[PDB]
Amino acid sequence: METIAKHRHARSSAQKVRLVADLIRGKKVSQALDILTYTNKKAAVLVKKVLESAIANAEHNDGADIDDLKVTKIFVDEGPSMKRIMPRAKGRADRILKRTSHITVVVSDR
Amino acid sequence: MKTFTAKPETVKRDWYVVDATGKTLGRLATELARRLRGKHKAEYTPHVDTGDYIIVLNADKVAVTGNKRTDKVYYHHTGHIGGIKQATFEEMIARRPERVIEIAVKGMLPKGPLGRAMFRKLKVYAGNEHNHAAQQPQVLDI
Amino acid sequence: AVQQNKPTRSKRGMRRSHDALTAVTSLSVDKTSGEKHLRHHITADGYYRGRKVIA
Amino acid sequence: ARVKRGVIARARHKKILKQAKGYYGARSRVYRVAFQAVIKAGQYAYRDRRQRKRQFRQLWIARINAAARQNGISYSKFINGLKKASVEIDRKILADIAVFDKVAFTALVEKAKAALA
Amino acid sequence: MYAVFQSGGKQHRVSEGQTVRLEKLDIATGETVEFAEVLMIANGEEVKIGVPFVDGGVIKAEVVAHGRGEKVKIVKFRRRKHYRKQQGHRQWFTDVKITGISA
RNA sequence: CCCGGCGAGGGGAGUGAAAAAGAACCUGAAACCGUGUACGUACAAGCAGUGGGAGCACGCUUAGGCGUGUGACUGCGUACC
RNA sequence: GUAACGGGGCUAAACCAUGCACCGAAGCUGCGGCAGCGACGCUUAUGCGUUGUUGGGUAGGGGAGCGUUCUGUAAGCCUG
């Protein structure tokens, strides 16, 4: 029995969020929460919220027990980019890209 | 049918012992290289090693012809600018007698990983004794 | 100064092979409250080494 | 009568990219770079169909030399003796026998020696 | 027991019960074929060598199938000279099963 | 109904032939970026493939075979217009 | 940076004369397959059977074919 949680159109870069995602793969949920509580990065907050939502779904829609859950999968993908303009010297112009990501977490008893 | 090919997991190898007193350097090195590579067996295979282990004794008693004891020069370079160095046959025999035979045989072997692995089965000593009595080598006359 | 050839994703990964984060080894347990905290720091309620320090 | 090109173009590109499976980097991902990697492969195959035979004959000859020098003759004299004895076995079969049957090879060497005597 | 014989411009070494692939022959399926130009017969320690053929030596075989082999591609290319060409090829064969060796 | 800041975003329940038709909504190709499994890779020098060729994993047959993926070592080999 | 035999090494594994073997190419022979051009016999609606010979190619000339969109045969044929 597996349960899913997603965060779509999140304001960050996949490269930056994968660093935090790599810390908590294959671990128990309580230990994962403890690890995430003491990481001094901005992506820790987002990943933590997604994990908490997944646990709540697991125990409300599927009748699960917290003490037997495990982070079975986690991944980050790219989203659409916003395009902006930045002036430079001597009348030149430049393009600015603002990147976005999708975050997915899967928890299971097995 | 398809032609036979040797398999490195099942190959026989023997141990031989040779004496170098009063022998010509190149005419000894030819035989040593031939037997290290394994050209004397009907199971010869270019991409496999089918040779034997050979011990050489009395390396500081090899012989050369002509005026080569004073006129054969070994060169090398160090990698720093200006670092070219040379030695003579007599100086080499005085300082490091095994290197003579070692270099001579190395020059005659294939260039690559397989040749580098072939070179590992040669054991050269400067005297008349060795400590490989547990392998039971056989006397080989060249 | 700029590149004459486009690099490869293999080189990108090889360069990034030193960018991994490190986790905290262990957490400490207070002797009165029983909370978890960083070693040599105060707890979230105001304890340090068994004594209340902040209201 | 206006004609479009998408279906045929895609089919051609896919046909070429299916032959580049296993190559490294862009050579199995990009059409411009993978087209050049197929022509060269064809050229090499055409040349190697001819190099194969040379390689195998050389191997057979080396093995026969090794086998004959163990009975006490050299390759050239052995071949001359067989020619004078009117034996017409080829080098492939001779190498096979040298590896898998040694009594027969000794018999052949004696025949050649008797012819040369 | 094994014997050597010649067919199709090439030589083969065989023993009883074996299947052999040769160039195309002009015999129908299920029929018998006889090779009566044999070069060598070996039966353990007994070795007969022809000069060039053994006297009274025969191999009998049966035909099994005809067919076509795997495809090959031919590519020709001359660089900077505006020349390219391509071709394909398959080759015929016959299969026989050895039934008897008589010396 | 539930997690979340009375957010953004999601998991259930329900509509419908179909929700991977959910409003960023027919079909959804390529470049480009990820997660999982099998094999190889830390004494080895070059247009990266071709000819030869062990070992390992897996699918039919269970008689010999045979097919698919990876590929140590070795000969030859300086892109296209 | 050895650096005026490719290298190792060579007193012949150098040079001169005579002889006999062997290696060595996509050249020649062997086995199987495709196509072009002639000659000769039945006879051709332009075919069959024998036989001789040929098939590296830029600029450029000659012959024969594949696939895409639209019109008729089609108020036909395939298809929840």
In DSSP notation, chain D reads -----HHHHHHHHHHHHGGGTT--GGGGT-HHHHHHHHHHHHHHHHHHHHHHHHHHHHHHHHHHHHHHHHHT--HHHHHHHHHHHT----HHHHHHHHHH-HHHHHHHHHHHHHHH-
* Beta partners for residue B18, in sequence order: B56
Residues β-bridged to residue B133: none
Residue written as token pair 């370079």:
B77
Q: At what angle do helices D75-85 and D102-116 cross, to 10 degrees?
A: 70
Tell me, letter by letter, the H, E, C secondary structure of chain A: CEEEEEEEEECCCHHHHHHHHHHHCCCEHHHHHHHHHCCCCCHHHHHHHHHHHHHHHHHHHCCCCHHHCEEEEEEEEECCCEEEEEECHHHCEEEEEECCEEEEEEEECC
Is-contact E1 E42, C-beta < 8 A?
A: yes
- B42, D67: Cβ pair inside 8 Å? yes
DSSP helix/strand/coil, B69: helix
CA distance E40 to chain D (A): 9
Contact status, residue B54 vs residue B31, Cβ threshold 8 Å: no
Report the distance separating Cα C52 and Cα A73, nearest Å: 41
Which residues, 6+ apart, have CB-to-CB distance to D18 below 8 Å? Answer: none
For D84, list phi and psi in degrees, rounded to 5: -75, -20
Report CA B36 to chain centroid distance, whole Å. 8
Name the 3-class secondary structure at B71: helix
The integer distance in angstroms from the CA atom of A61 to the C1' atom of F19 is 20
Nucleotide in closest CA–C1' contact with A79: F33
Question: In Å, what is the separation between the CA of E87 and the C1' of G53?
Answer: 25
Nearest CA to B13 out of B49, B48, B45, B57 is that of: B49
Structural domain for B124, as ranges: 1-142
Residue at token pair 């859950």:
A69
User: Which position has the token pair 């195309």?
Assistant: E24
Distance, in Å, from the CA atom of C50 to the CA atom of C53, rounded to the nearest integer, reads 9
Distance CA B39, CA D65 (A): 9
Helical (H) or strand (E) element with C51: strand C51-52
Q: Which residues of E17-45 are buried (b: 16+ CB within 10 A; e: fewer)?
A: eeebebeebeeeeeeebebeebbbbbeee
The verdict on a CB contact (< 8 Å) between E47 and D93 is: no
- Give SS3 for C23: coil
The Cα–Cα gap between D109 and D73 comes to 8
E and A in touch (3+ CB pairs within 8 angstroms): no
Tell me which DSSP letter residue B63 carries: B
Q: How many domains does chain B have?
A: 1
**Among residues B54, B62, B59, which one has the least CA distance to residue B132?**
B54
- Residue A46 and residue A49: Cα distance in Å, rounded? 5
Tokens 């040669």 sit at which residue?
Answer: B122
- Of B32, B39, B38, residue with least CA distance to B17: B32
- Spatial distance between the Cα atoms of D105 and B15, rounded to a whole number of angstroms: 27
Residues paired with residue A74 on neighbouring β-strands, in sequence order: A105
In a 13 Å sphere around the CA of D20, the CA atoms on its Cβ side amount to 23
Burial class (CB in 10 A: 0-12, 13-18, 19+), B105: buried
Domain with A8 in it: 1-110
CB distance B24 to B64 below 8 Å:
yes
**Nearest CB to A23 within list C21, C27, C36:** C21
Measured distance CA(E31)–CA(D31) in Å, rounded: 53
The two three-digit tokens of residue B97, written as one number: 């007698």
Contacts of D3 (CB under 8 A, 6+ apart): none
B68-91 core/surface letters (b: 16 or more CB in 10 A; e: else):
eeeebeeeeeeeeeeeeeebebee
Phi, psi at residue D93, to the nearest 5°?
Answer: -65, -35
Query: Could you give the CA distance from residue B56 to residue B98 in angstroms, rounded to a whole number?
Result: 10
User: What are the sequence ranges of the domains in chain E?
Assistant: 1-103
Q: Give the helix ranges, DSSP H, for B17-141.
A: 25-37, 68-71, 89-95, 97-106, 113-118
Mark yes or no for CB contact D63/B40 under 8 Å.
Answer: no
Question: What are E92's strand-pairing partners?
Answer: E68
- CA torsion, ordered B20, B22, B24, B30, to nearest 10 deg: -20
What backbone torsions phi and psi does residue A89 show, to the nearest 5 degrees? -80, 155
Residue A37 contacts residue A61 (beta carbons within 8 Å):
no
Pairwise CB contact (< 8 Å): D100 & B43: no
Minimum distance, in Å, between the CA of residue A38 and any CA atom of chain C:
8
* Structure-token pair, residue B40: 């004397």
For residue D66, give how far its alpha carbon lies from the nearest alpha carbon of chain B (Å). Answer: 5
CA–CA gap between residue B123 and residue B59 (Å, rounded)? 11
CA distance B52 to B30: 15
- How far is Cα A51 from Cα A73, in angstroms, rounded to an integer? 11
Cis omega before residue B97 (within 30°)? no
In the three-class reduction of DSSP (H, G, I as helix; E, B as strand; rest coil), residue C47 is classed as strand
Place of tokens 């009063």: B22
By three-state DSSP, how is residue C26 classified?
coil
How far, in Å, CA of D66 to CA of D73, rounded?
10
In chain C, where are the structural domains located? Answer: 1-55
Chain D contact for B2 (CB, 8 A cutoff): no
Contact assessment for residue E9 and residue E2, using Cβ atoms and an 8 Å cutoff = no
User: Dihedrals φ, ψ of B55, to 5°?
Assistant: -110, 135
The crossing angle, in degrees rounded to 10, of helices A43-61 and A29-37 is: 150
> CA-based Rg of chain C, rounded to a whole angstrom?
23
Residue B7, phi then psi, degrees to nearest 5: -125, 125
Asked if D56 reaches chain B (Cβ–Cβ under 8 Å), the answer is yes
Q: How many CB atoms lie within 10 A of CB D8?
A: 10
Answer positive or negative: Cα dihedral of B32, B36, B37, B41: positive
CA angle at D53 for the pair D47 and D56, rounded to the nearest 5°: 130
Other beta carbons less than 10 A from residue D23's beta carbon? 15
Question: Is A90 labelled a binding residue?
Answer: yes
| D with B: touching (≥3 Cβ pairs within 8 Å) | yes
Q: Which residues of A touch C12 (CB under 8 A)?
A: none
CA gap B33, B110 in Å, rounded: 10
d(CA E91, CA E24): 9
**D26 is near strand F: CB distance < 7 Å:** yes
Residue D83 to residue D105: CA distance in whole angstroms? 16
Strands E38-42 and E47-49 turn out to be antiparallel
Tally of structural domains, chain A: 1
